[PDB]
Amino acid sequence: RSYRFPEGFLWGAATAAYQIEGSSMADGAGESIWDRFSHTPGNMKDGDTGDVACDHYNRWREDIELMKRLNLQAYRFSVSWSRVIPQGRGAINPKGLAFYDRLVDGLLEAGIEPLATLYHWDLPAALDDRGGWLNPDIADWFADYGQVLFEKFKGRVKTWGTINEPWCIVDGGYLHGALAPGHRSAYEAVIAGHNVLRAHGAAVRRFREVGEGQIGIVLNIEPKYPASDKPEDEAARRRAEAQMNRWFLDPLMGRGYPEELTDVYGAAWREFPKEDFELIAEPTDWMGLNWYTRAVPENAPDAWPTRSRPVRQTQHAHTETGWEVYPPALTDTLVWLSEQTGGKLPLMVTENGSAWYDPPHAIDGRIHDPMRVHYLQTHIKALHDAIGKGVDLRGYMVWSLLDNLEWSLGYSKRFGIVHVNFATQERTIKDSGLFYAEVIKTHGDVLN
Amino acid sequence: SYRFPEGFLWGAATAAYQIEGSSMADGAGESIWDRFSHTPGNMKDGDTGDVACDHYNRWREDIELMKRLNLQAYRFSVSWSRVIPQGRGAINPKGLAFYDRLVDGLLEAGIEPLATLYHWDLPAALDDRGGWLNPDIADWFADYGQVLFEKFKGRVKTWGTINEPWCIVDGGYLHGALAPGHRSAYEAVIAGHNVLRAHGAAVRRFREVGEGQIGIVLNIEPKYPASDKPEDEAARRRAEAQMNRWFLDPLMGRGYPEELTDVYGAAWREFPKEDFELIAEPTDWMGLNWYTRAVPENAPDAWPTRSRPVRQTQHAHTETGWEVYPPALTDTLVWLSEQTGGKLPLMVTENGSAWYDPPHAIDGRIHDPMRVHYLQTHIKALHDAIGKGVDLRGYMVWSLLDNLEWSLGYSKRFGIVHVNFATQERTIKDSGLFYAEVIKTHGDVLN
Amino acid sequence: SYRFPEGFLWGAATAAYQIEGSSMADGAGESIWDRFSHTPGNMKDGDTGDVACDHYNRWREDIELMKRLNLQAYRFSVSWSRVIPQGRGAINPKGLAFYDRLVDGLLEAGIEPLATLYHWDLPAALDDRGGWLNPDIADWFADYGQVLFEKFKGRVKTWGTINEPWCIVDGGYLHGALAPGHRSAYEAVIAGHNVLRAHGAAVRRFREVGEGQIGIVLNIEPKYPASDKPEDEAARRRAEAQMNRWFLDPLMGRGYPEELTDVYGAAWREFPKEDFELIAEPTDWMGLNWYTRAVPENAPDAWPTRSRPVRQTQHAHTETGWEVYPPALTDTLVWLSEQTGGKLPLMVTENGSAWYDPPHAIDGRIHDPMRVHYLQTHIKALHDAIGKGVDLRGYMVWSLLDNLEWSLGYSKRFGIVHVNFATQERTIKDSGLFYAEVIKTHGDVLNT
Amino acid sequence: SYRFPEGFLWGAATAAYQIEGSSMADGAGESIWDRFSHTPGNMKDGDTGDVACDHYNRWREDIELMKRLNLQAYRFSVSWSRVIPQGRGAINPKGLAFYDRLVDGLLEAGIEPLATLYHWDLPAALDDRGGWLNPDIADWFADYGQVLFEKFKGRVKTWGTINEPWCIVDGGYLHGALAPGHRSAYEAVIAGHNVLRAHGAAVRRFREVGEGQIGIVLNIEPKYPASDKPEDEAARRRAEAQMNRWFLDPLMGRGYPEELTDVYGAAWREFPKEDFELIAEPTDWMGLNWYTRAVPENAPDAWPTRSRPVRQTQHAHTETGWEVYPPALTDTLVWLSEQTGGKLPLMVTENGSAWYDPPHAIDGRIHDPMRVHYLQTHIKALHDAIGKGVDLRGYMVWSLLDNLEWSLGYSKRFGIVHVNFATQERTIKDSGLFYAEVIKTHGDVLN
Numbered sequence A: 001r002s003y004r005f006p007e008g009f010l011w012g013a014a015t016a017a018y019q020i021e022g023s024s025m026a027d028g029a030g031e032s033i034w035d036r037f038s039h040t041p042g043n044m045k046d047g048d049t050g051d052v053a054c055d056h057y058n059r060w061r062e063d064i065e066l067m068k069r070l071n072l073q074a075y076r077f078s079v080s081w082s083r084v085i086p087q088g089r090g091a092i093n094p095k096g097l098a099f100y101d102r103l104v105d106g107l108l109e110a111g112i113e114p115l116a117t118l119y120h121w122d123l124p125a126a127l128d129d130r131g132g133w134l135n136p137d138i139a140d141w142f143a144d145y146g147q148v149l150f151e152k153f154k155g156r157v158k159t160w161g162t163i164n165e166p167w168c169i170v171d172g173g174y175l176h177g178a179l180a181p182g183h184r185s186a187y188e189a190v191i192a193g194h195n196v197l198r199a200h201g202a203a204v205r206r207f208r209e210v211g212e213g214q215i216g217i218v219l220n221i222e223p224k225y226p227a228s229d230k231p232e233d234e235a236a237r238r239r240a241e242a243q244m245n246r247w248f249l250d251p252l253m254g255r256g257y258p259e260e261l262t263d264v265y266g267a268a269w270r271e272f273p274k275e276d277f278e279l280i281a282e283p284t285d286w287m288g289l290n291w292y293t294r295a296v297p298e299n300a301p302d303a304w305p306t307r308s309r310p311v312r313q314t315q316h317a318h319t320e321t322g323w324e325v326y327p328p329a330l331t332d333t334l335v336w337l338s339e340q341t342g343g344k345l346p347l348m349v350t351e352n353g354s355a356w357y358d359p360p361h362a363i364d365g366r367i368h369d370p371m372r373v374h375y376l377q378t379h380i381k382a383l384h385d386a387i388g389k390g391v392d393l394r395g396y397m398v399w400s401l402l403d404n405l406e407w408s409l410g411y412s413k414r415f416g417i418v419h420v421n422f423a424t425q426e427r428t429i430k431d432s433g434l435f436y437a438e439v440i441k442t443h444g445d446v447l448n
Numbered sequence B, D: 001s002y003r004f005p006e007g008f009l010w011g012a013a014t015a016a017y018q019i020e021g022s023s024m025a026d027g028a029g030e031s032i033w034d035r036f037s038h039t040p041g042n043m044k045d046g047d048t049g050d051v052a053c054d055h056y057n058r059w060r061e062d063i064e065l066m067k068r069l070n071l072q073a074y075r076f077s078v079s080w081s082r083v084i085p086q087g088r089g090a091i092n093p094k095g096l097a098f099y100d101r102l103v104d105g106l107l108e109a110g111i112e113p114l115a116t117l118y119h120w121d122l123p124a125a126l127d128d129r130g131g132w133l134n135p136d137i138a139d140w141f142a143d144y145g146q147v148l149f150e151k152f153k154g155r156v157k158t159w160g161t162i163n164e165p166w167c168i169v170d171g172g173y174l175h176g177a178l179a180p181g182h183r184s185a186y187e188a189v190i191a192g193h194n195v196l197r198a199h200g201a202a203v204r205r206f207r208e209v210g211e212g213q214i215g216i217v218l219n220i221e222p223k224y225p226a227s228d229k230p231e232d233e234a235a236r237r238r239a240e241a242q243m244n245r246w247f248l249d250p251l252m253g254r255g256y257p258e259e260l261t262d263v264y265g266a267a268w269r270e271f272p273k274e275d276f277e278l279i280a281e282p283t284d285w286m287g288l289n290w291y292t293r294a295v296p297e298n299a300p301d302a303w304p305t306r307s308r309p310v311r312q313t314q315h316a317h318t319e320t321g322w323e324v325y326p327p328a329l330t331d332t333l334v335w336l337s338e339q340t341g342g343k344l345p346l347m348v349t350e351n352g353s354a355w356y357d358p359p360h361a362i363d364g365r366i367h368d369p370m371r372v373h374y375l376q377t378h379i380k381a382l383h384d385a386i387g388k389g390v391d392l393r394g395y396m397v398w399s400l401l402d403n404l405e406w407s408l409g410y411s412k413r414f415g416i417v418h419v420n421f422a423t424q425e426r427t428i429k430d431s432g433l434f435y436a437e438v439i440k441t442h443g444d445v446l447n
Numbered sequence C: 001s002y003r004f005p006e007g008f009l010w011g012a013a014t015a016a017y018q019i020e021g022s023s024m025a026d027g028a029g030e031s032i033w034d035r036f037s038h039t040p041g042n043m044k045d046g047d048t049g050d051v052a053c054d055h056y057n058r059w060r061e062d063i064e065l066m067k068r069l070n071l072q073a074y075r076f077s078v079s080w081s082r083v084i085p086q087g088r089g090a091i092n093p094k095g096l097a098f099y100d101r102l103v104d105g106l107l108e109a110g111i112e113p114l115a116t117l118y119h120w121d122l123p124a125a126l127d128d129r130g131g132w133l134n135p136d137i138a139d140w141f142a143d144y145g146q147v148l149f150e151k152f153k154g155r156v157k158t159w160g161t162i163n164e165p166w167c168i169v170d171g172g173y174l175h176g177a178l179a180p181g182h183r184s185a186y187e188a189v190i191a192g193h194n195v196l197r198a199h200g201a202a203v204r205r206f207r208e209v210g211e212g213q214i215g216i217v218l219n220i221e222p223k224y225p226a227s228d229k230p231e232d233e234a235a236r237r238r239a240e241a242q243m244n245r246w247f248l249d250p251l252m253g254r255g256y257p258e259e260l261t262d263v264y265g266a267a268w269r270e271f272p273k274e275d276f277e278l279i280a281e282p283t284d285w286m287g288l289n290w291y292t293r294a295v296p297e298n299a300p301d302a303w304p305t306r307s308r309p310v311r312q313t314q315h316a317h318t319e320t321g322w323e324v325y326p327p328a329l330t331d332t333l334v335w336l337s338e339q340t341g342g343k344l345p346l347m348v349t350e351n352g353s354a355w356y357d358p359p360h361a362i363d364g365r366i367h368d369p370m371r372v373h374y375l376q377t378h379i380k381a382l383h384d385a386i387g388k389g390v391d392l393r394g395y396m397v398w399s400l401l402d403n404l405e406w407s408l409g410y411s412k413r414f415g416i417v418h419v420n421f422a423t424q425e426r427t428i429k430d431s432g433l434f435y436a437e438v439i440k441t442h443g444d445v446l447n448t
């Protein structure tokens, strides 16, 4: 059984700005919604903030050396909007942009392909005071922001992500309020989802106008499996699936919004002008999939708003985030996604990984995380299985390069293949990282 | 004796979303409360303002009720989104026509219309543009004000701009118990500033295109000492600054309270010099909303004022949990008279109490002796305040009707007229009958 | 007319721990409520019965208030631990002397003393031996009963054994909202059984050494249909069985309700037959405590009866959240008459309502029109019940005094006499003033 | 070097309700955990001990597992309700026959049986008589003890009376998180006293009819300073007194800690002198159950010790939220040696850690590196304690099997042998393998 991956298959690791950078108000950088959110009592586990995080803003060179040691061929990262344009619109912050300039040059020097994401949940607070994702004008704002980077890194950054996980942004930020900006409203949720899609489309158009290379959106998908043969449970499954997995993909593929949403959001649902949908379906060059687990939803009449709830799959191992470990569902998702996009759209797993308990410090220079290693090997094999079934998969990015701030869950959830001691900023490569380095090095042959 | 000054104006007060119903009828736009009340968990028993008192349909009956109560003034608010569905742009003819009919009808009955521009029901379309976090609202509001100023020129002579900035910001942006349901000190500071600016802009617009008298309406809750411990006094001043001085001081041209720098910490901001010039734009009158006092003590974990009220078990409490203590009204009025230098005519735009009443009348009656008591003792307290030199021009009872007490739903009844929400049947309570006699005798019944 | 039958006895009721105070005074022992009320979280506002109405010291004043109210009867309870500090053994002379003086004072006033042996205040020493879970309590109780039976032989002629077995067991052992604060269906079943046995043993002992009439006091909350749906009728029957028939049926020699097997499942037990012979020991009268009705519907997650009341929003509710609905009193009396075969003399030993009153009088008055309304409508309902052939001999208002409403503390005022708990000053409410007229006119005032 | 003293006994520990299952099978009576676990809300995920590890049926397999681990001792508890169904009266032949078979099987395997009389599973019939609140239990327990003492005379030579009085009382009577689920300080004080008395009575009875060595087993959680704040030191001493000195002190003839008067307030009681004579009956050995330390700070609303632990984020924490800090073991042992005058032979009857393991093996393996780390560091800490003169005779790993962690259910795995609760399949973890090597080399594997 060979597990050699196709020629040119790109191996890498991923991060996000607010989760690792720190130095949030340094060198002209503006205030973001997460600056506000994390400094409001009760919002974050243990009162954790992104003020320091992995201190990546200061230690990025060391982190690049770590990327070299892991044999990374790509590094997926996001750019902080508020660091580059403090008020979201208007004046550019020279120092802030200069950081990412140095970073990208350093990556290219090391032979690492820089994969940049425009928006990873950190909207400028100044734009939030103008309504944030509820204001349609954001489609323009985002575009302008996108342009600034497109021209600045022309020929250096060739592969672009627009939005990272619209569902997390809207469902967490506007529907239930567990994430910044912390709103709880179905009305706002539908409007926000629509404007996130529109902003993506606008950014793609602007990219056609001034940019060079390939651009696409990044979706998280959590495949919904049957709980039973009861029709109410199938209705539950379809509601959950529609709200989470089809909400954004369908209009991006020109299929409009899922019918089930009319039922999920009820009186909060809206009909939008057709030209919005033409803008939203603006053709992309590639698509990123963020994948971690599956769910098995059953009917739940009091669960707002999808009226569904996951059934705990006690037959399998679970991560520290409470996610079932089940690799075949990755293969299934990749096939499903290939079908939804017609096989015409190049795909990349832009995020995959797992959180398990690690001690806060290295133990004799080591971190032994056997379950993370297991997750890594089984899911990469599942990737190979997906390619064997004809899915056009071009690459794989491990979430995450570093133990970092897992947003509202703080530092308690470690996703890194590199351990970070948050007291000393000391980095220690985990057994999972060592293994991943070997997987890259053998181009998959180590799995045989 | 308790006879009141000549020309002293007696009335009752309401607000649009709390009584109107028909929130989406006849072109009416969606407001932030339409959204808020239809989100599960926000409202007690899942109550909404969809029907309320059905006043949009029964306003004539309600006016006849005003006549039975001998009212000389009626304080009400205009729903911004009913008049301007998108907050800016096209006027909604029927929505404006409702208030046209209402005001004309009031004038026919000899009742003075006291109009409030904003009573917490922001158009949702403006909320999607940031609401009170967007400085442009100062202009938006002004334009809205103009529409009314010109429409009711010569008919509505007494105007309120904003009703209770503190409730709007503290409830709506700081703690999130009210629409639009945000919870942020940063947003609270910005929103408070833009509320004050909006008031100023509306007053300027009124100077250019309006006719009559214009002013803001503040709620004040006097903070009394819990002890002689210094940390408790510091607590008292934090609470007082955050609730009672936050808006009054910049309105009187004295800037923001120093204590706010301590209350909001990193969320506090410095604002441009000209903003305070706009905010202190001279007004003609001021409204006071008053219900109770508080006795704050130090509470380090209470965010963000680090203070909390001490339950005053020696006195009666309302169904909203507010201490019954009329002397604090007198004091407050005096205090207010002093903060505004005595030059600014004051009016009690809201005062009243919530007690349990049955959901239906009992042989054509509702017996509410505690509400009657609250009424008589606090009106006497008004007389005492006038005796100490306060230029107090009138008194409006909250409320004319049992209505939607926002997030607390219909469970909190403030009306001097009972509303059976099953049948929309109105029954005048004993408090209403008594209030009618207080008006007719111009206070002599209190002797 | 609303004139009541000849000899119809009007009175008012209290309980020891709710009014007395002086819980550890003059040799008095520790009760389960002494412990319970001084455990944080158990009582609203941290209220205790340490002082209450200070009745232990102000009983003479309270008797003068009874005369002013024209009371013909005063129903009160005797604190077991005040009379027998350890529950068994040595008698406390001063403690017993209190009730001696009280009873003599009542007789001096021309007031019928109505004594209750047990009103929820078990001696802590007996609770340490298992309390109502220990079958030997049937004997302990009997012995305690004997002490009183002999002491007031010829003075107290009408005796209550247990006040509301359902509240004792459901509140004290099933859900833990009342002392001793256990939460167990197993314990609930056993405790209910032993409470019934204790009642029987006490009645037998009364036959051996006592004089007059003896009976139990049950509270009943009639369960009305929420719908004609069979699941709701089954729910109604479960609730009715657990609350209204659990104790009445074995007392009438009918055994335990079948539905209990379904309600309690694995916690249900079969008991020896002679136990049921003991439980059905013939009594002379029965007390009904009545306040409201319920309208139960099916509720699969409601433990353990799988039912829940539907809020009857068309009617007024008290501050304890109880629907005001007088016809249900009439129905209940009829029902009870039918269950007891018409052969057992009935008395309403508790009826009343809680509404907000200020903490102090207002120029010498307390105006409680809703309590007055409750009083007049429910007394009229009694007349209706007598008109339907129910053998009703009397009516006791709960309560004579504002007192400690157990776990709900002093916030719930049931008194027709207001108590300022800051000053212990008594002020007769409008309800008391009206009730005095009801007694005086023997019901004729309800006409005019 | 880490070679241990000659005769140092290596073993592993379990408890009856946590592993046996078949709780009311073969004549066995109902225990308080039978009731408690089958009452909704009491147990995580609704887990019960109905099946557990099915040890009642699979004990032979488990003994083969003990042999593969090179165990020299197996510490287990006897279910009171399995042996005497009503707690008093008739013996249950089958229930006793199980432990007879078990003990013979262990002796046959060359494994020293260490028996515990009470590990939290009081017979329900005795709970209906007041349980640990009824002083008569001192006698009941004694009788129960006698039954075992005589049945296993010459076979079971090392006896434990009570396992962790503090958990029994604090969990079962003070806070109500454990069976019998009471929450009362009054009851907590009484129950603690009667547990101590029961221990004494059992020791006396053992002197009359038993053979071998008898002792109690205490859990100790050493309390370290959170700060130099005096309120925090007072907090530390309250917590220390309530948890670590409550039982040890009267066992050593020093009476109850003074601080308890402050902790329990009005619930505290004075007891007869002869009670303390009974409680201090001389024992032959003492068991220490040890897992972690705590760092308490002042907490006025924390009932009743008014203290709370400060999270030590510089160190690793187990899945039960317990800090991993091996030196505190060494210190504790020394402290215990000092409190007992160095004259009383000590044994660590429980030490171990809970980390996440998958519910099934991979592949026929369970890799638990943190449990291995915990094991090596704490065993080294034992060696350090022995080097300082502590008379430590043995070490028992908690636990032999993944089992029911009481109210936290099966989610907390303490086993050095993994149990697949779907299939009852046992798989020796890396920790078990390593421990087997530690026993074999008598410590030399550590170096």
Ligand SMILES: OC[C@H]1O[C@@H](O)[C@H](O)[C@@H](O)[C@@H]1O
Residues within 6 Å of the ligand: A016, A019, A164, A165, A220, A290, A351, A399, A405, A406, A407, A415
């Ligand atoms: O929750 C784990 C991860 O989920 C990903 O899909 C998000 O992009 C990350 O920001 C987050 O850390």
Ligand SMILES: OC[C@H]1O[C@@H](O)[C@H](O)[C@@H](O)[C@@H]1O
Residues within 6 Å of the ligand: B015, B163, B164, B219, B289, B350, B398, B404, B405, B406, B414
């Ligand atoms: O809480 C009672 C009343 O308080 C007033 O100050 C507000 O303006 C009303 O909207 C509210 O119903």
Ligand SMILES: OC[C@H]1O[C@@H](O)[C@H](O)[C@@H](O)[C@@H]1O
Residues within 6 Å of the ligand: C015, C163, C164, C219, C289, C350, C398, C404, C405, C406
């Ligand atoms: O719930 C109010 C009243 O209910 C009666 O059934 C109880 O016997 C009283 O003790 C209690 O005060």
Ligand SMILES: OC[C@H]1O[C@@H](O)[C@H](O)[C@@H](O)[C@@H]1O
Residues within 6 Å of the ligand: D015, D018, D163, D164, D219, D289, D350, D398, D404, D405, D406, D414
């Ligand atoms: O909490 C983990 C362990 O703690 C020990 O002290 C108890 O004796 C065990 O029964 C329990 O499983």
